[PDB]
Design a protein around this ligand. Structure first.
Ligand SMILES: O=C[C@H](O)[C@H](O)[C@H](O)[C@H](O)CO
Ligand SMILES: O=C[C@H](O)[C@H](O)[C@H](O)[C@H](O)CO
Ligand SMILES: O=C[C@H](O)[C@H](O)[C@H](O)[C@H](O)CO
Ligand SMILES: OC[C@H]1O[C@H](O)[C@H](O)[C@H](O)[C@@H]1O
Ligand SMILES: [Mn+2]
Ligand SMILES: [Mn+2]
Ligand SMILES: [Mn+2]
Ligand SMILES: [Mn+2]
Ligand SMILES: [Mn+2]
Ligand SMILES: [Mn+2]
Ligand SMILES: [Mn+2]
Ligand SMILES: [Mn+2]
Ligand SMILES: [Mn+2]
Ligand SMILES: [Mn+2]
Lengths: 429, 419, 421, 421
């Protein structure tokens, strides 16, 4: 299937192939003068992928309000039709992460619907941070770390169910993020709470296929505003080290304390082989979940700088699971995921342009200036031509968001899907 | 009328009377040694009030979920009943802060309900951060500073409506907080948006009654995640200075950047007569909206230190409006509000024990240590006996939450309000 | 007796009647809550925190340093001042030394300590500033410097600190370094850490059987982009890699804005890697302000974790308590005196927590009463206990006051010359 | 000429050919975008940023300082080093002096400056550290000190700074103080601020008609609890209270974590009180790192505000640009060279922003395209424009590379004595 009319793609691409040729040829000539074959970079770029969050093709909100756009996806199947667009146009998101029970549906259908749309399935995402209809036990005071054995068991039961559904759709991992924490001093005993969590997580580990991975994800706060059981990579690490070889750490860029050097944390987890994967997005204040690289692009480059360095240093057995974890509250969800996904590839490409040998040289002789400049020369290089050409050759659009608006897709699904109503967000009932 | 049976309050008070006498008298003995009449403090304490927020009477939540308890208030009228409990037991919340359209109801009836319940109404809170049913223009991209004239006109009109309702219930102020901002660089033109906002607030100021005040409330972020038109007290001051004398700044404790010295911002505003009021709550990470004092009680005391100091220095016409802006996601909203209110009186109480003569002296001699230590001798004093005696003398409960749970009130309203 | 016994006496007498009233009032009040003020005072009496030798002198910032009168000229002077603090508070029997700032003949240090009734806490190495003669500079690092020769020299200095430590009775080595980078790309994170790990292992080898090696993390400063030991997570990896004797030292002001510090303490305790603390208060960065002066509640919440571990019966849990501060605008001695009191104050209040009730409210997810349970403890003015504790052990009911009355500062001011160049 | 003309020429001819390729490529790409590359280059050529006399010397922290070789000592060595920066970058024709640090005979300063091809930017008073002989200490504050005489001394010093300034061609006086407190209660916030506003009025009077007075805010350091001029809010209160000649100065690293700095800029511009900037970068606090070495996009966003100010043709908008960094682990010159380069880059890119389309996407609340419109400019490698601008004005294609080729560091190292060989 083709969510976008192939003629629209070819059309809009042809309307740009002229400029693209110039820019590309000019950049390839520059990189050439720098001992780099723009063709090897491009080659690698077309093969780099990140997963799109199913809960991301819909409009997000805040506790204060939600302002839905038009043609909002009604369910998981609609959401899949949308991601198919992002993939067709960028060729960088051939996989979708699901959230249960949100995208709960007949596995045969999901798998079937994806095969038609040319989409696969990334890591399963359990949900014990909200109560579903008929749920016997509330998650108000926690889930996997709740003081009630029955509630923890139910929480464990859910994650287990998530693994079955994923096993059936082709998923190879389970990411566990919970809001388990406390809003007040004394409310929780940090130790007992964690101990409970570790044990509960241990039972989930048993139900993990032999070729699967369990990813735990840390966050400093929200929904818990005083303490969070899985608050930082430190704790996260302790979890991965305890659970077993199949348990790794998930790093969501916007979940760190103000000014945290996030790229070091990536390196530390890589060092001890516990970097399960990422959750790309950007922010300025807290867990803002903004478009990848929209606020701090250099930071995103520095995170990939560690990733490429490991990739280059022959770090055997290093295939992190990349995913986009964003909330689009004031833009078309599709356009954002499209560009956020491209910004990720931009960062990657620039990281592949760094003179690794020259860098080591400067690090070794403590030449701080040239070291940081060595990185900058790569970051400064406008890799758009490479990202564009990569898309074109793989059958994507030279200019993704442009082709999309020209295809009219939004007005289209908008005419097929019911109208959404703007409402509160959760600060009150 | 009394939401809580008077016989239960009396019972629960006699039960603790003996102890309170012991503690109060020991405290009086201690304070007299420090040359402080415990009586004069109790006298001022039972006169300190702070209004409860209607939107805090029910369980709040986050963008990730909302976990309601039992007997949640069905509407504004339910909320007023629960606010009546809070006032009956603490005698510190004789007023309620409403939000329109959230609490929209017939002014005449709200007024009626309030009078019967012994409650009054504090500043009105306009709501142009969310779309009301039927609304012509969406506030998705802003309100008072929206690029589209029609949307700004609609925003202005909403606030003017808010003024009409409040005039009707005995309210004398309009607090304006908006989420206007941008989530991306370039998405907005900082100055132009601000210019629009000022122009829009100017119109509201124009329709403001002359026995009313206009409070603007700054916030660093949320809902906007890159820029916010009214981001800090700097922008806020510009705003109030421009609008006129009836427009002041409202300080919400959790709306500041990390490590910000908030008490200083409070002094500065008083110095330039632009401190309209507070939105009390506590926090640790962002605008957490936690019970006041539950995270940083000392920070709360320092804010009150500036309030009590202003009165000491002689500042005139300073009567900031005290309000509680909290969200209670995992506790009985009512019990939370009860202690938050008490905690606020606690900070005020201790700030009144500060020997200003001694303090001033150490400041002049640059004796930093004795200076800081002078504040600490006040803050370290357990003033609970004074807070309890004050409630006891004014019809309240020695142990508010204790008497509340003994009333089984929550079980009662949970039966009257199917879930 | 650095302070005349009659001064201490006279001053205690003048305040005896009030201490009696407040103490007995607090005793009654506490008795009503099922707490033995007596049992608390007795425990408070035995809570000791080590004073840093480098804190008894006026500290400064990169912009300036405003010394006071009577600044100590050397380690022996500092010890004399440390004895003033211990005599009056009775909460600081030990002193933490810094090599090479305090380097001196171990036998004289030991003798001056014994004579003053002072012992020596953990030894602190210094490879964050060059010393004269140094064959290699620590500009670009020390234990993790790219140059092996530089790392060797850092390792040697640490072993040397151990030797000095053994002679004066010390039982641990604390290692804090500025090693890091100010520019992205300057250092290869992983490689700099492997180097450090390799260097620390060697130091570990030189540890006595009854010694411990403490690694202290810090988010930034002097490194402004990356610090090798940046947070408790990296710190944990170090403790776990080096061995049983290796633990983590937590300095309150070394964390990112808003970091829940008490949790980290809880985490290290659970995994047996809580070596000790460096107490001090802060508001913006590693301010090193007097403990409890800014956030007294946070201090109490850290101690709540400390007292709870005891309550859970964690075995082999004996963390090293030390005060790590800089006093830039007060009399170093007066600040350390009160900082010591604030900590005993936090500790005291932690002991007043009705944990049986706390455990109840926690299990019942009664968040409000839970938090309220801690507050009942924290809101108690424990000063009478701290003062009575001092009296019974020969300290001053009002330390700073007795110190001012003794004219000590003025005395040492007339005895010590100010540094001119 | 500090650096040899044949070296510059040599290094430039060496890179001139490839520069041509890149430059013509950008002019091409910028043409298909509707931009005249030669228009940008002409403006870039005239973008100047003052160089701090204290920046040419290796910086340090409260823990240590590792001076490099050939350290300039005394204002004269310093001017000689700043001259290297101006010659190779051509973007720093003027120097900011700090009194008393660079105190000397005005006539000789002015004389030495013309000899080197340097002017003198705003004067910088210093009442945050005590100088030898000083009657009163600034330990507890200067312009806001509680002691009248201490404040008179500060006023007078600043006034002296204006006189030194008038004699060398300076037109403004920047006033940054450490004044604040480290403990709650120590200072009475309002009273201290009143004493400061009163003293500042005194200085204001000494300002010539064309002279301006810049006050600089800082969240913390050296004060660790509260600072008199803590934020831009207080700053504004000061500038609008002292008068038309007094404006606010904004040092990028003096803001609370996560603060939106470019917005503060806008707000001040709109109100005619943006006196100028102090460029540098940070990640934690006032790290005072090389501009754009940490968050280059933020530098651009600040500059996007500065450039838009030109277009909207704003009034009273004439910001004094100064670099205020501290180089602790690199050659002070090389750093200042690339910092001044990074600043021009920001400017160059902000200048490529299609204001028309931007404003278009703003009114339509088309946020994604709006942000993408900024990304199109910022994403453009404007180095070819930077090098070309340098080449046309007598600068070097690759400043640091030419600097290194000139072997200048080694030269001054041989002329100036270190502390140790
Ligand atoms: O904040 C929550 C984390 O980003 C999790 O990955 C979460 O599952 C995601 O936001 C979708 O719910
Ligand atoms: O962040 C919101 C501010 O605190 C406002 O006062 C708001 O109206 C209040 O929180 C109600 O939601
Ligand atoms: O920030 C530095 C840490 O406090 C270290 O413990 C340091 O060695 C101490 O301050 C003494 O210099
Ligand atoms: O003294 C160095 C500089 O650093 C300070 O933080 C301020 O930026 C001020 O400009 C001062 O002159
Ligand atoms: Mn995530
Ligand atoms: Mn940042
Ligand atoms: Mn998130
Ligand atoms: Mn508020
Ligand atoms: Mn804090
Ligand atoms: Mn709020
Ligand atoms: Mn320390
Ligand atoms: Mn420290
Ligand atoms: Mn500056
Ligand atoms: Mn600075």
């Amino acid at each position: 299937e083709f969510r976008i009319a192939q003629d629209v793609v070819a059309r809009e691409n042809d309307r740009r192939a002229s400029a693209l040729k110039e820019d590309y040829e000019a950049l390839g000539a520059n990189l050439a003068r720098r001992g780099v074959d723009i063709e090897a970079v491009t080659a690698k770029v077309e093969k780099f992928f990140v997963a799109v969050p199913s809960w991301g093709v819909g409009t997000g909100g805040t506790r204060f309000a939600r302002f839905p756009g038009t043609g909002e996806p009604r369910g998981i199947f609609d959401k899949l039709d949308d991601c198919a667009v992002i993939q067709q146009l960028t060729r960088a998101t051939p996989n979708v992460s699901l959230n249960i029970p949100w995208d709960k549906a007949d596995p045969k259908e999901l798998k079937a619907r994806g095969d038609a749309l040319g989409l696969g399935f990334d890591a399963m995402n359990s949900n014990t941070f909200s109560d579903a209809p008929g749920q016997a036990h509330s998650y108000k005071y926690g889930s996997l770390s709740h003081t009630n054995a029955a509630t923890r068991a139910q929480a464990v039961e859910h994650n287990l169910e998530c693994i079955e559904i994923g096993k059936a759709i082709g998923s190879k991992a389970l990411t566990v993020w919970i809001g388990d924490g406390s809003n007040f001093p004394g409310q929780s005993n940090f130790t007992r709470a964690f101990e409970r969590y570790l044990s509960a997580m241990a039972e989930i580990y048993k139900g993990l296929p032999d070729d699967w991975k369990l990813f735990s994800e840390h966050k400093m706060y929200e929904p818990a505003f005083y303490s969070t059981v899985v608050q930082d990579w430190g704790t996260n690490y302790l979890i991965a080290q305890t659970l077993g070889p199949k348990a790794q750490c998930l790093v969501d860029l916007g979940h760190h304390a103000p000014n945290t050097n996030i790229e070091m944390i990536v390196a530390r987890l890589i060092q001890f082989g516990k970097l399960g994967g990422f959750h790309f997005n950007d922010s300025k204040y807290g867990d803002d979940d903004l478009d990848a690289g929209a606020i701090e692009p250099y930071r995103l480059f520095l995170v990939f700088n560690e990733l490429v360095d490991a990739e280059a240093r022959g770090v055997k057995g290093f295939h992190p699971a990349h995913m986009i974890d964003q909330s689009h509250n004031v833009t078309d969800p599709i356009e954002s995921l499209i560009n956020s996904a491209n910004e990720i590839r931009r960062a990657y490409a620039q990281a592949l342009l760094v003179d690794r040998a020259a860098l080591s040289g400067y690090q070794e002789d403590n030449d701080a200036l040239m070291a940081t400049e060595t990185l900058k020369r790569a970051y400064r290089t406008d890799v758009e031509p490479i990202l564009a050409e990569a898309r074109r050759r793989t059958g994507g659009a030279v200019d993704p968001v442009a082709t999309y608006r020209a295809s009219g897709y939004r007005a289209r699904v908008a005419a097929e899907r019911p109208a959404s109503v703007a409402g509160g967000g959760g600060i009150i009932g």
